[PDB]
């Protein structure tokens, strides 16, 4: 039902759970990295510019 509480719960679940992002192919160790997520309204994954 996506009720109004669930986001305040989600923003507690995730509050510091690292998630692993990797492209493919992934030639070298730097090609999988972990980041702390922060929530977004859209549908794209917002990545950091330098990385």
């Amino acid at each position: 039902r996506e009720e109004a509480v669930v986001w305040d719960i989600l923003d507690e679940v995730i509050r510091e759970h690292p998630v692993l992002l990797n492209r493919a192919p992934t030639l070298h160790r730097l090609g999988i990295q972990a980041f702390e997520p922060v929530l977004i309204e859209g549908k794209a994954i917002q990545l950091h510019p330098l990385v």
Binding site: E12, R15, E16, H17, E36
Partner: protein, 51 residues
């Protein structure tokens, strides 16, 4: 804090640092221990690191 900066000095074996961080977090998660540091409603993994 977001990373193990001082614990890297504590545990020069480096892998031992994951194994001790998980040991301490098992004291909290399964041994029922609670940490001393003054939280303000936050997820505890960054506290498990500190040992």
């Amino acid at each position: 804090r977001v990373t193990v900066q001082d614990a890297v000095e504590k545990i020069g074996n480096r892998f031992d640092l994951v194994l001790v961080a998980a040991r301490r977090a098992r004291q909290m998660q399964v041994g029922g221990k609670d940490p001393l540091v003054p939280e303000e409603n936050d997820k505890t993994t960054v506290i498990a690191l500190r040992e």
